[PDB]
Design a protein around this ligand. Structure first.
Ligand SMILES: *[C@@H]1O[C@H](CO)[C@@H](O[C@@H]2O[C@H](CO)[C@@H](O)[C@H](O)[C@H]2NC(C)=O)[C@H](O)[C@H]1NC(C)=O
Ligand SMILES: *[C@@H]1O[C@H](CO)[C@@H](O[C@@H]2O[C@H](CO)[C@@H](O)[C@H](O)[C@H]2NC(C)=O)[C@H](O)[C@H]1NC(C)=O
Ligand SMILES: *[C@@H]1O[C@H](CO)[C@@H](O[C@@H]2O[C@H](CO)[C@@H](O)[C@H](O)[C@H]2NC(C)=O)[C@H](O)[C@H]1NC(C)=O
Ligand SMILES: *[C@@H]1O[C@H](CO)[C@@H](O[C@@H]2O[C@H](CO)[C@@H](O)[C@H](O)[C@H]2NC(C)=O)[C@H](O)[C@H]1NC(C)=O
Ligand SMILES: CC(=O)N[C@@H]1[C@@H](O)[C@H](O)[C@@H](CO)O[C@H]1O
Ligand SMILES: *[C@@H]1O[C@H](CO)[C@@H](O)[C@H](O)[C@H]1NC(C)=O
Ligand SMILES: *[C@@H]1O[C@H](CO)[C@@H](O)[C@H](O)[C@H]1NC(C)=O
Ligand SMILES: *[C@@H]1O[C@H](CO)[C@@H](O)[C@H](O)[C@H]1NC(C)=O
Ligand SMILES: *[C@@H]1O[C@H](CO)[C@@H](O)[C@H](O)[C@H]1NC(C)=O
Ligand SMILES: *[C@@H]1O[C@H](CO)[C@@H](O)[C@H](O)[C@H]1NC(C)=O
Ligand SMILES: *[C@@H]1O[C@H](CO)[C@@H](O)[C@H](O)[C@H]1NC(C)=O
Lengths: 116, 211, 311
């Protein structure tokens, strides 16, 4: 008889008190608005759209959720802007200017020393 | 200057603090468990039973809490190996990004590495990576070599470009054209083996000096 | 599911399991840490490109023939011929397997973007804008980076392109290897088969079934027998989770090496000895494999030496 963990998805109280629930590999007919069936389980409380945005709250298998404008949505993470390179057999592209960029990288080096 | 705006991120440093705080909060809470015994205060179980009857109940609690310590220490060893691997990466970057210039791709930031500056963080290190990023490209027509006097000329460094009517030599990382001369190029082979070779003039400085 | 693994359906057990504290919370927290890192491992190895690049329709790069590593348009999956070979070689009592965040179609799209960027712009797109240059000229710069004068390619372009095309063609013969990928599957399958089998053990109790105990015994004594089984099966879960953490650190170290090679072997030219294959590194092409990555390393190897006198 079906079973599967239950997790609660929240855009964090500090922004809204709504929530959606995913029942892992549970069919939406055997759980007991917005009901969407995905190969990862039954998603309740978010509407599934065909657009794509950046991953917000990973749901699994390509889907995400998040707030929009007043609600929670579940889309499919897109992979990025598409772009064709203007290749030819006798063409080249050379920069005529430049910028200097600065970026951060953070690394941990130690923990607290404990004794029992 | 924009770096401060992005700060005023460090979740990797807070996670280290959280993981140890959670193991210490759990280790203490595991003392309020009976493990199937009579009570959990080594005193109750004592001032309430005989030397030969309070021995079984206390032995159960001892086994349970001794298992708690084994769980705690095993996880600290596994987690200390992970922070050690991170400290090894940070020490390696300190040598190769700060004390020198690296050619390793993406090891010292995004772009072409120029320099890096360290900053101290609590239980960690922050690297300020300075990189070179090209911008504003234009397209040109190119050719691998140029024919002059029936001989093939190849660039010493750079690429041949055409602006539409004339051909120049440029360096590969910044557009800066110069005239193609015999001091800019070298000769190798004939114009019968290079695919895509084009006709142009390569100027010799000697003859116009000799009028 | 800690409660369904240990107790299993029974409800008289649930009140007894609550008496051991937060062991079931620790198991869920520990396993969630692994579950989140395994998706990040994949993003760091493959999601190193901003835009999704495409090759031009003609697909003829001065001779060099890359059809064995580019996608096949006549397929539902859009895999390459070599990727099709790579994927052709490799529920219980409270146990479940979660799906990956990225499908394997999405991973194939990251790989085709890296291939299309490299073949048309070399390594420039990894440091800024993609700058087109003819491929034959890309190869000539790569020989220059290893100390060979650039006329060696321009006067022998046909020879190098024809020899390359056969050398890459031999790769399929060596495949039609991936034992490192099958071992990952085996190690997890073995831990899940052992975890389930450990439920048929009495651990010195009268029986191994928490309902049968009650059916033939009073509560005062049944609490002791069930507590023994709970301790035994709770030890099973601690063994399982501890090994998953130790083994996840090893696959994480491998994902870090694969991400580092993706940057240094594919998005650029390396001078590190033996880091990008055997010989003098020219270029590398990625291919997707199930739970892994395959690197096709292109190297320069000298041949046919003669001896000379020198000064
Ligand atoms: C390269 O880029 C910089 C900007 O990043 C250009 O400098 C600016 O030039 C404009 C005039 O075109 C001035 O009004 C700005 O004050 C300049 N900015 C700075 C920070 O000095 C520079 O001219 C560009 N080079 C070329 C050849 O176009
Ligand atoms: C390509 O650049 C050249 C050099 O700037 C341009 O040719 C002219 O060259 C003569 C010398 O031979 C100069 O006195 C002129 O001032 C140049 N004209 C210009 C507009 O720069 C040529 O015009 C350029 N070609 C294109 C298509 O822009
Ligand atoms: C580049 O210049 C050379 C030299 O003028 C050209 O070679 C001539 O080619 C024509 C045919 O196009 C022959 O009739 C001549 O006999 C060749 N001259 C010599 C000295 O061999 C060459 O064709 C030119 N290339 C292009 C593309 O115009
Ligand atoms: C690239 O290589 C493939 C083979 O790996 C070529 O495709 C084969 O071409 C031969 C004839 O040369 C045919 O007999 C095979 O049936 C082809 N195979 C397939 C799957 O179609 C392909 O022609 C090469 N491309 C170029 C431009 O030469
Ligand atoms: C062959 C090719 O890619 N040509 C493109 C063209 O499609 C695009 O409209 C133009 C402006 O972005 O740049 C160039
Ligand atoms: C959450 O609320 C506090 C005030 O209670 C505020 O300081 C903080 O910025 C809020 N967080 C977010 C993400 O809005
Ligand atoms: C759920 O069951 C219905 C039939 O009642 C079926 O059509 C549907 O495909 C099932 N969903 C899943 C995800 O299997
Ligand atoms: C999304 O597109 C598919 C076709 O690719 C279509 O069948 C489906 O109905 C669309 N979904 C929505 C919510 O419009
Ligand atoms: C160069 O030309 C190509 C078309 O051949 C075009 O797509 C590209 O945008 C051009 N680059 C610039 C900087 O104009
Ligand atoms: C480039 O390809 C075009 C056809 O698309 C052809 O006309 C031209 O001659 C080619 N250039 C070279 C140098 O082969
Ligand atoms: C060069 O000469 C040595 C003997 O001095 C010999 O052993 C070696 O095989 C020769 N190499 C070639 C390519 O003939």
């Amino acid at each position: 008889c079906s079973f599967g963990g239950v997790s609660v998805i929240t855009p964090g109280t500090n922004t809204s008190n709504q929530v959606a629930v995913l029942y892992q590999g549970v069919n939406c007919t055997e759980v007991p608005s917005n009901v969407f069936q995905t190969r990862a389980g039954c998603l309740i409380g978010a509407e599934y759209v065909n657009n794509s945005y950046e991953c917000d709250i990973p749901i699994g298998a390509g889907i995400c959720a998040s707030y929009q404008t007043q609600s929670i949505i579940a889309y499919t993470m897109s992979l990025g802007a598409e772009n064709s390179v203007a290749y030819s057999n006798n063409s080249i592209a050379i920069p005529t200017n430049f910028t200097i960029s600065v970026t951060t990288e953070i690394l941990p080096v130690s923990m607290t020393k404990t004794s029992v | 200057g924009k770096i401060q705006d992005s700060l005023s991120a460090l979740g990797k440093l807070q996670d280290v603090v959280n993981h140890n705080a959670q193991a210490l909060n759990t280790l203490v809470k595991q003392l309020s468990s009976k493990f199937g015994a009579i009570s959990s205060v080594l005193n109750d179980i004592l001032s309430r039973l005989d030397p030969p009857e309070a021995e079984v109940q206390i032995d159960r609690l001892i086994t349970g809490r001794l298992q708690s310590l084994q769980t705690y220490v095993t996880q600290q060893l596994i987690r200390a190996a992970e922070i050690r691997a991170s400290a090894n990466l940070a020490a390696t970057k300190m040598s190769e990004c700060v004390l020198g210039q690296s050619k390793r791709v993406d090891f010292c930031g995004k772009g072409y590495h120029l320099m890096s500056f360290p900053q101290s963080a609590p239980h960690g290190v922050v690297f300020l990576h300075v990189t070179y990023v090209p911008a504003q490209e234009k397209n040109f027509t190119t050719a691998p070599a140029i024919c002059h006097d029936g001989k093939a000329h190849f660039p010493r460094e750079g690429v041949f470009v055409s602006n539409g009517t004339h051909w120049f030599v440029t360096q590969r990382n910044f557009y800066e054209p110069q005239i193609i001369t015999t001091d800019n190029t070298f000769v190798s082979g004939n114009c019968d083996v290079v695919i895509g070779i084009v006709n142009n003039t390569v100027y010799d400085p000697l003859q116009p000096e000799l009028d | 599911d800690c409660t369904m693994y240990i107790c299993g359906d029974s409800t008289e057990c649930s009140n007894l399991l609550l008496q051991y504290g937060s062991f079931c919370t620790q198991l869920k927290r520990a396993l969630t840490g692994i579950a989140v890192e395994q998706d990040k491992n994949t993003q760091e190895v493959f999601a190193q490109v901003k835009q999704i690049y495409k090759t031009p329709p003609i697909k003829y790069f001065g001779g060099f023939n890359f059809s064995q590593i580019l996608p096949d348009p006549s397929k539902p999956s859009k895999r390459s011929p070599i990727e099709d070979l790579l994927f052709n070689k490799v529920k219980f009592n409270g146990l479940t397997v979660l799906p990956p965040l990225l499908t394997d179609e999405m991973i194939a799209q990251y790989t085709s973007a890296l291939l299309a960027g490299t073949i048309t712009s070399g390594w420039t797109f990894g440091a800024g804008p993609a700058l087109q240059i003819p491929f034959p000229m890309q190869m000539a710069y790569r020989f220059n980076g290893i100390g060979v004068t650039q006329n060696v390619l321009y006067e022998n372009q046909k020879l190098i392109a024809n020899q390359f095309n056969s050398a890459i063609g031999k790769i399929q013969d060596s495949l039609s290897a991936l034992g490192k990928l099958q071992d990952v599957v085996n190690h997890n399958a073995q831990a899940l088969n052992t975890l389930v089998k450990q439920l048929s053990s009495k651990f010195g109790a009268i029986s191994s079934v928490l309902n049968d105990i009650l059916s033939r015994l009073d509560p005062p004594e049944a609490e002791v027998q069930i507590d023994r089984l709970i301790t035994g099966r709770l030890q099973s879960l601690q063994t399982y989770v501890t090994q998953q953490l130790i083994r996840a650190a090893e696959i994480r170290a491998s994902a870090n090496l694969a991400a580092t090679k993706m940057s240094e072997c594919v998005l650029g030219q390396s001078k590190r000895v033996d880091f990008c294959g055997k010989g003098y590194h020219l270029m590398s092409f990625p291919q997707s494999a199930p739970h892994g990555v395959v690197f096709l390393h292109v190297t320069y190897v000298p041949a046919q030496e003669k001896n000379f006198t020198t000064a």
